[PDB]
Nucleic acid binder design. Sequence first.
DNA 1: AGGGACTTTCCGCTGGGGACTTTCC
DNA 2: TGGAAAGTCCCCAGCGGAAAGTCCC
Lengths: 284, 287, 287
Amino acid sequence: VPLEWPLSSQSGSYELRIEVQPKPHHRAHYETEGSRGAVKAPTGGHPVVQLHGYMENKPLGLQIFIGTADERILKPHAFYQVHRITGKTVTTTSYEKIVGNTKVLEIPLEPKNNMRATIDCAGILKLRNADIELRKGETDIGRKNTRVRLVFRVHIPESSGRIVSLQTASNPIECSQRSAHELPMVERQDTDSCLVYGGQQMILTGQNFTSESKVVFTEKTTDGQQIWEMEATVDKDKSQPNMLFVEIPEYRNKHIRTPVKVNFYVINGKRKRSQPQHFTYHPV
Amino acid sequence: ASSVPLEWPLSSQSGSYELRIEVQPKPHHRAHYETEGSRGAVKAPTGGHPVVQLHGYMENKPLGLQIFIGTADERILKPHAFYQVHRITGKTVTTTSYEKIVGNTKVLEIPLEPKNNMRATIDCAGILKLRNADIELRKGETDIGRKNTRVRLVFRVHIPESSGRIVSLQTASNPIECSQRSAHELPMVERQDTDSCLVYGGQQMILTGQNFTSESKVVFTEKTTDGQQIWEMEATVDKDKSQPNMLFVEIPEYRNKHIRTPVKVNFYVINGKRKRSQPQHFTYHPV
Amino acid sequence: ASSVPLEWPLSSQSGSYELRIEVQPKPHHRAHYETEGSRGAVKAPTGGHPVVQLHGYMENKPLGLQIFIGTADERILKPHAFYQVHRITGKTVTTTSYEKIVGNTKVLEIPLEPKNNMRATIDCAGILKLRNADIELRKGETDIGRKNTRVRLVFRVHIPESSGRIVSLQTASNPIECSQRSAHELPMVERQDTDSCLVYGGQQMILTGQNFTSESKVVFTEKTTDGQQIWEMEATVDKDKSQPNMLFVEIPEYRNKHIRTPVKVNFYVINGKRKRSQPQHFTYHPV
DNA sequence: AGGGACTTTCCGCTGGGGACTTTCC
DNA sequence: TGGAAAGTCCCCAGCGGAAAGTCCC
């Protein structure tokens, strides 16, 4: 009965499975924000849980709560609470209740549905560390502890007064926001010059090169006044996290007799840009 | 008996009495949280501390100066609810100090003695930042923490006259910002007007890039094929001429005066202790 | 053409004159659109129709009694722009009437004849809801249509004194809701025995109005002129004695305990989440 | 202490469900 | 007119970003 307690997902001819695991990440929401929705599956759908081996005809109650991911044996995560998702499109009916300091949702597992359930009313609230730590008793730390597991459990009543209690966890779920863009960083370039017609393909080696990354060639005066800007073409295909394939643009002045020294940088999004790289254009 | 509300308005001068702020504190002062230790006492631009003094005091008795953090907002002065003075003790802490709570305002009390001219140097006073989460929860305070990060150093003293009357002088410093600035932006060099020069150095070099702050420095290096930096000289920057995109630098002299072959060295720009640009290239020429 | 601008605030008396509303209109009168027939005339809850009168007129010249529909907001009186008086004619219509138009406002005018003691039963008036889209597409307006669906019957009779001056009384009626919508949802306070009490509260108040479900709730709030609802406290609403028409509220305790000057605050009934009465008035007294 | 690294709060955008309004019976 | 149904437009869950607050290294 108590939340934190060793339980297997299967006993005798009874087995509780996560037929459909949730996504790896799921930014949780604060009480001061709206809701950020329910935990979804990679497919775009939702997780699914099921109880195999049931003979009876009386529906059961599937219990849901946010637990820990760390090594230690499963226990309610003191910094997260399942958030009950209501209507709008929610299909599984759900009841909400507290258990100690843990909120717990409970949807029905009706046999008319092979004791299968589509968890799509489960969201993830995030308590404020300060609020919890300060609690007299808790000796845990919220700081940097932002992973969880959807814990599902069903209690199977036996016509023998006995009760078989099964429990099941989802794969770990990361619940913190993750920056949309990383800072690009060019460490090496297989080209440092080339004729003004450009054309050739240059390969950059660095970090955080997403497929959206872009490359810009510029040239400015000692003043700082930019007197030339040209975006360079990238070989999306070959492009990888650590390597970049670009097509050195044509320089602005076809006919030059002196080598021209220009600049270029990779950029992710509207801000995250690496730093000025050097290149040179040689006379025809 | 000297208990007059901190919300009570008092003035800097009364008759033959005036409490001026001799040495105002710095515009900014990073305040510390309780989870942190302390981050010093407030300091004056001098590099030392702020100074308070009571002028027009003929008597020869030891008075008690009071200190606390006030609100530097569009309303009337009053104790800031998210900030408290912080008592600093020990070593270089010259002036002595006494701490005490009033309402929810921690008040510091230093001594104002005649032997020193009813003058004092503030150096046992720091600014602790209370948590927005804690304060707002208090059944009462209707104020917000969100962006309220300006404070003021209020000083007040209760003078007891023979006439039985107790004059009360109060005075608040100028505004002090209590939120650490913005960490450093990565300097970026896109161009330089010089690529080499005689080992005697001494010439001025102009760099063109972004994120250069007068608080920027330029460092020259040189390593072996192994990467062993076998040299490291800091070049002088022309603080005046320099700007966001233009950094003026004085090429430092080379280590080995007499060489026969050209030496290829490097140099980088740096903001703060960390944020530094990537190595740039430069060459010193034999005499 | 002695029509004096409708915006000019005017007392309901000027000397021994007194323009009163003998009988008051119902709390509600669903108005009709120009795509519907007419939903009839305004009536008194007594069953009959609203009654107006003028006291202090010894003369014999039967005077006219203008009538237009006005706003029922916090602001000063002003001609409502999403409502027009509808001139109703017929058999049972005892009183005659003349319909004119002052600018974008349609005005009605019946006779206030002396041979009736300067009385007048208003059984010939209706209210026409205008489409919000059309009044909001007017070059010169700034008021919102949506939700703004409360109005008041406005009267004002011109009187010529033998001294050259033209007096002018005006006496609008209670507020009237014109939408079957809110008429059925929104709760309306119409009576409150207590206007004020001391800052601690406790004192129990009785409200008499309409649409008071067991789910009703009262809420005291206070806001700065800037509209900053700073305080909001829900008063315990006696679920017992309360009835479809009466509520017993335990006046909550005011937020500031040591207040000096009376603080005026607002309170309101509210069912569900949207269904809420109109801002009521109360004033807390210091101790 | 100087500088960041992780946690909260707060701003904006968008689509389909209501809240209201206006047309019908 | 009393009762709605059809029509319109506001509003907020859900998210994605990112600035302000806290507090480690």
